Design a protein around this ligand. Structure first.
Ligand code: B12
Ligand code: B12
Ligand SMILES: C[C@H]1O[C@@H](n2cnc3c(N)ncnc32)[C@H](O)[C@@H]1O
Ligand SMILES: C[C@H]1O[C@@H](n2cnc3c(N)ncnc32)[C@H](O)[C@@H]1O
Ligand SMILES: *Cc1c(COP(=O)(O)O)cnc(C)c1O
Ligand SMILES: *Cc1c(COP(=O)(O)O)cnc(C)c1O
Lengths: 212, 516, 516, 212
């Protein structure tokens, strides 16, 4: 690892940013990270980098005000018989997970964590109530595909009552991914490496695309 | 501490009285109950350890046993003792036997109460000794080595792999650190069991484990004698196993541990009742163990606007103070916390920070206060960051804070490198030495910004605690009046692990460790 | 300025009286003489410029002419004027003619004294106007643009190539600098002539040239209106051509210039008599021109132990003050200097620095004090250096210094890069803004280190000036009692350029610019 | 130009120092300068460097105390008819030249600048007087080799009286160099790029070699 700083003579762009990455790798073992980038002049720019899109909380909150105009509400839970909750707690808790703060920590967001073992029938009752914009269902046990059955059932339920489209349905859990997600009826699925910011940035853009 | 702010100590005493009301009121509730986690702590204090086949900690199964047979209200201690009487096997063996399905504490004849209770108390008596001795072990090392009187440099290590944490901890130990904390795995406070054994892998940092504690302590002890200093070890109590983690560190003898009354409730959605019962007993153990706890007020400043949340922090500190007291923890053991988190572009900002830091110092004169570094505005500009870590270092020496959590120029970027740690320490030693007497030398103008800022924060914290006292703590949390967070009296995680005490309940450890 | 140090102003007034004695005493000597350099300045003020064939400045040849014909004691002004009377050619043409060997000021009929003298005075009168006007030009720009009230950021440029200095100066101008100084070529104060024309190459920095001044001023004026600020330009007067460089900048209108009474003597071995006569007239011109001078007390701290030389610095400041006065320069024009040069490893060191800086501020309440950055202990550790530049920045805002010479994290390494300049300015703006009112807020304990340090320095400077006053300045220098440096009353460079005035001597410029 | 910092795991040596230079160049356009080098541990060391022996005042002063034991005295001058002095002033003045402070600025050194046009006969009288250890003669005008004649004459003079060996004779000036110097009788000659520290470090070592 190496700390390396310098300054290029290009207006402060994401291009110059790249130039920075270039000039970095171009000088030995890389995988550069341009930690800081600020301009000294409209024609000059300083750089700090280390070597060898996802909105952020501040941003997604702005995006919500300038694009949606009201606080959005999200209801999540570990549905069915699944008692695993650490996961949904990683995205929904104030404290969040590994540095990424949960959705309840966001200003333009009302996150309602209903916890573990929530019957789809109850989940839906609760989404209609707190008038949710985003539904979050987490699944962990894959035993006899009890999860695929359960997530599939929640979709039928929603649709049978003519409700699916009212929501951005997100699913995730250790054995989940976006491929599995889409072919089941959900708008997106999030695996073990994802965090609240990943969810937030996706939910907010989708909302916007829909509300148009 | 002299009064440099001309603070109104009547107001101070008035605020503190409200915190005491709020606390005692909630205490009435704590005493009338126990929790699944309290009992597992009790079991551990009596020697039950190890795991079963599916890697479930034996304390969880023995207590889970008693639980489903409607026994918890009496509390582990009795059954465990009863069992030992007519059975004569060690509680460790009582555990394995219960695991194997070879015993049933619910169906053994329940000998005379006064007989087991007495047995209970004789068992408790042993481990309390081990603990009491560890406290002496520490006193004994300080007198041999002496202890810094200025601020203590507190650094952090966290690879997720214990053996790796150690090579880093000992390096940091001689690089000059006085307190070393191993960052607990992200989210551990959500687990309802404590993993068993050494940990070789973990996200966001190393798991909290009794074995892990022992290794680290053994290490620090080695490099300690080396440098002729006693490195204080620190870990986190927060979560659904607070007491257990506290009993755990009491027997391996950590020196400081994070122990906040409202953390779990406000930031991890752990049920308020469960949380208020767990903190009470973890605090008792820590207190008796001679441990210095750390509160987490920084959590209130890392995201909210730090300038306008200063009274929340002061109120939080008062409230933690009062509970710690109800658990026998004295002021010289309460490492109350605060932080340098205001926006660096704020005019006179440094004057407001200094003021508040000075305020807390005068309000809690006997507490070894914990002052934490800036993090929310720390950016990729490593140069600017080093200087705002410097203005942070200045406040500590100007206001006599005692536990100094060193800021890192690389803060917003990654856990520190060998270099990041060194630079951070030289920055702190330069400022601490160059401005050594600055707090005696410096005074504040009559009714200027500094003094007026402090009194506004104090008047506001008093105002807040007046409402909190009007509603009682639970109602306060139910309506989000504190921390901008609303939480359900019967919501959150762990409520199902809370049980009311029945007339024959008995924790021999309370009278041995508290005793009023 | 309020009295935060509880300084004994009687002692202060007593010290200042000794400096005034020392000065007036030496003044008796200055008035009884003139120097080869004074006269060349007089010639320039009257329009003589350009060079001859071998590139010798015409002022040097016309005055060298008068010199070898035993004429200097009367002083250029007369001959030049006499010549213009019976000849009717411009002094510029008088010069060329003398260069060509076509005239001889010594053999022209010397018309009636009172007639040429009057002619002299009428000539002086013109250029004084150009000057007086430039002073208005500046006043006029300030009122249009306004002026910072806090400390002024002073930065340095020096490529050795004027056109290059300019691209750097304008960049720095908008990067936020308030005062720009072009570092003069190393050793120029040793030359007995001022190079003529723009400079494209030079060691240690760009030559000081009237053409060079004009270019830079033209530039700063351009970027100035751009940013809507009036950038102050600065250069060095030090050396054997002090007055000339001052007359020079008076006509191109620099805003601040280095002008120390003892520099040349103590650090360049330029003869004391020559030096004391040159500084007197350069100071008159600068003063009348509205220029703020800068003294070089840092020279006393960059190598000697700064903690024990603090009284030398204070004595130096007093002494420069008193001379500046005898030359008509008011306190709001004396940018007396000092520095943050104590060892960073010195315990309470920052408290001693703050104290002395506060001392000078209270002693010279009307002076736009110049506080300079650390340099001797600035090392390759760019990180540590940035923070000691920060402690330096703090002193300025805590003590209200007016001209702030920004320190560079790269100090000990090389002239700053674009980045080094930026970082240095943000560091200063962060501290200046974050601690904005810190001087009103902060006070010092009764008879603590801070206040006691200041009074010791003051008592010591008074003690030093008492001996200096006992011996008179020349004897003082002959024995090294001041600055740890001994210098011969008739030694050093330039004594042979010193002449005593004869009864008919006349500088029309003195009465026009001083007039008592 | 580039600012670059990092840390190697080698005890704080001049070898590790080199390793630092190596690891630097090894990573693109170089000509590295290891601006700072300090150890974190006996087995570790930090580095700061920039890319694309001469004692110092503090040191030569120590060297003088620990090796010579008394202050050394140096007398310099521009000899003969040569009025050029800026040069000798660059090495002898308190202020020195381009950052390098002159010999009179040194603590364990008494520098006596006799200035310009000093007749060899006077120069020698003055060296014997202030009992010099180091003589410094500066020459600039080379016209009809008037300088070579003059410097040659000063040597004869010195020797004729049996005095040469009492001194470390250094010469220098714009058209001077150590080759010219040695073949004329002087112990060293210093060209236009040299500074007081260069002179000091050479005079002090030579003194030591002689005094042994
Ligand atoms: C802790 C734990 C428990 C706890 C749960 C604690 C709690 N409060 O949640 C308890 C003890 C109750 C438990 C019980 C059981 N468990 Co378990 N448990 C674990 C363990 C150790 C950790 C899980 C964890 O919390 N990881 C941390 C979180 C952060 O990871 P994550 O779920 O992958 O979350 C990430 C992504 O998935 C995403 N995400 C998750 N959900 C969602 C939803 C949305 C909408 C989005 C956007 C993103 C998202 O966010 C996170 C990244 O930030 C695992 C083993 C392991 N190491 O995984 C077994 C494991 C899950 N358990 C297992 C089993 C077998 C069981 C039990 C059947 C055991 C028993 N009693 O026999 C029961 C089931 C109980 C039930 N009814 O559900 C198996 C399951 C195997 C399978 N695939 O079927 C596992 C994998 C262990 C094993 N290897 O055998 N368990
Ligand atoms: C300034 C100057 C003058 C000044 C001198 C000012 C003064 N106070 O010293 C004055 C006006 C008096 C002058 C006069 C003359 N000058 Co003239 N002058 C110059 C000029 C512009 C600068 C010289 C300088 O000071 N350089 C700066 C110093 C720092 O450089 P340096 O001498 O090389 O010093 C370095 C090393 O040499 C070393 N060093 C020097 N001496 C020593 C001794 C020791 C012991 C050591 C260890 C190191 C050392 O230290 C320095 C590095 O740090 C040069 C042209 C030029 N650019 O060089 C002509 C120049 C030297 N002058 C020249 C001439 C022709 C003359 C005159 C004959 C002109 C006339 N009247 O006709 C006279 C001679 C007078 C005399 N009797 O000596 C010529 C000489 C050509 C030749 N080789 O013969 C030059 C080269 C110009 C030219 N190109 O025509 N001059
Ligand atoms: C699913 C994982 O959770 C842990 N675990 C801890 N307590 C229990 C419990 N009461 N039941 C089941 N697993 C448990 C085990 O380590 C197991 O492997
Ligand atoms: C030797 C160099 O010094 C400069 N110079 C300045 N003044 C004089 C003087 N009186 N005599 C000779 N050269 C002089 C010229 O620029 C010349 O070239
Ligand atoms: C951040 C923090 C932790 C770590 O929390 P987990 O909830 O275990 O992820 C523990 N205690 C406090 C007081 C904290 O601030
Ligand atoms: C360092 C300095 C200079 C530059 O000096 P030269 O003597 O021209 O090399 C000029 N004036 C002052 C006051 C200085 O400190």
């Amino acid at each position: 690892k190496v700390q390396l700083s310098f300054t290029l003579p290009l207006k402060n762009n994401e291009r110059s940013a790249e130039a920075a990455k270039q000039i970095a790798l171009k000088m030995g073992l890389e995988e550069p990270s341009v930690v800081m980038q600020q301009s000294l002049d409209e024609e000059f720019t300083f750089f700090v980098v280390y070597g060898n899109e996802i909105l952020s909380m501040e941003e997604t909150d702005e995006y919500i005000k300038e694009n949606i105009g009201r606080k959005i509400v999200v209801v999540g839970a570990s549905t069915g018989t699944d008692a695993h909750t650490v996961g949904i707690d990683a995205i929904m808790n104030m404290k969040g997970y590994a540095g990424h703060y949960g959705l309840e920590r966001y200003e333009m967001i009302d996150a309602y964590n209903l916890g573990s073992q929530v019957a789809n029938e109850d989940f839906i009752k609760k989404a209609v109530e707190l008038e949710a914009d985003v539904l979050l269902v987490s699944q962990t046990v894959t035993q006899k595909n009890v999860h695929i059955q359960n997530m599939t059932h929640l979709i039928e339920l929603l649709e049978a009552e003519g409700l699916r489209d009212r929501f951005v349905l997100l699913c995730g859990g250790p054995r989940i991914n976006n491929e599995i997600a889409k072919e089941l009826g959900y708008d997106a699925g999030f695996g073990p490496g994802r965090f609240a910011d990943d969810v937030a940035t996706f939910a907010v853009k989708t909302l916007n695309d829909r509300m148009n | 501490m002299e009064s440099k702010l001309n603070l109104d100590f009547n107001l101070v005493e008035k605020a503190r009285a409200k915190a005491k009301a709020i606390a005692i009121d909630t205490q009435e509730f704590i005493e009338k109950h126990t929790t699944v986690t309290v009992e597992r702590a009790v079991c551990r204090l009596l020697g039950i350890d190890g795991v079963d086949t599916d890697e479930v900690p034996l304390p969880n199964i023995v207590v889970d046993h008693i639980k489903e047979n409607n026994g918890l209200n009496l509390g582990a201690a009795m059954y465990i003792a009863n069992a030992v009487l007519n059975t004569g096997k060690t509680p460790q063996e009582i555990a394995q036997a219960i695991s194997a399905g070879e015993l049933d504490l619910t169906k053994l004849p329940m000998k005379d109460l006064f007989e087991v209770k007495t047995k209970a108390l004789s068992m408790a008596k042993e481990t309390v000794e081990k603990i009491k001795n560890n406290r002496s072990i520490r006193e004994s090392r300080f007198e041999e080595y002496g202890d810094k009187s200025g601020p203590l440099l507190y650094v952090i290590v966290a690879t997720g792999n214990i053996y790796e944490d150690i090579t880093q901890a000992v390096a940091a130990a001689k690089q000059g650190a006085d307190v070393i904390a191993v960052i607990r795995t992200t989210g551990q406070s959500l687990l309802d069991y404590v993993p068993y054994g050494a940990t070789t892998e973990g996200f966001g940092g190393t798991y909290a484990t009794q074995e892990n504690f022992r290794l680290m302590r053994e290490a620090l002890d080695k490099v300690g004698a080396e440098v002729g200093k006693y490195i204080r070890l620190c870990n986190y109590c927060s979560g659904l196993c607070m007491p257990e983690i506290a009993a755990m560190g009491a027997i391996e003898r950590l020196d400081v541990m994070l122990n906040d009354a409202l953390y779990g409730i406000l930031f991890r959605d752990i049920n308020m009742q469960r949380t208020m019962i767990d903190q009470n007993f973890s605090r008792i153990i820590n207190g008796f163990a001679g441990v210095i706890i750390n509160t987490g007020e920084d959590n209130y400043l890392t995201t909210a606007d730090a300038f306008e949340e200063a009274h929340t922090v002061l109120a939080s500190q008062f409230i933690n103070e009062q509970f710690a007291l109800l658990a026998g923890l004295p002021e010289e053991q309460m490492g109350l916390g605060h932080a340098f988190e205001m926006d660096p572009e704020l005019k006179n900002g440094f004057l407001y920070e200094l003021s508040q830091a000075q305020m807390a110092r005068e309000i809690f004169p006997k507490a070894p206060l914990k002052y934490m570094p800036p993090t929310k505005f720390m950016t990729g500009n490593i140069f600017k960051g080093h200087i705002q870590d410097a203005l942070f270092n200045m406040v500590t020496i100007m206001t006599n804070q005692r536990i100094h959590l060193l800021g890192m120029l690389t803060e917003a970027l990654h856990t520190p490198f060998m270099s990041d740690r060194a630079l951070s320490i030289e920055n702190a030693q330069y400022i601490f030495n160059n401005m050594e007497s600055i707090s005696e030398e410096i005074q504040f103008k009559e009714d200027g910004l500094i003094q007026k800022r402090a009194g506004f924060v104090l008047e506001k914290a008093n105002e807040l605690l007046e409402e909190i006292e009007q509603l009682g703590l639970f109602d306060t949390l139910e309506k989000g009046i504190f921390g901008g967070v609303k939480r359900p009296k019967d919501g959150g995680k762990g409520l199902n692990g809370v049980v009311s005490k029945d007339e024959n309940y008995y924790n021999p450890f309370v009278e041995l460790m508290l005793n009023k």
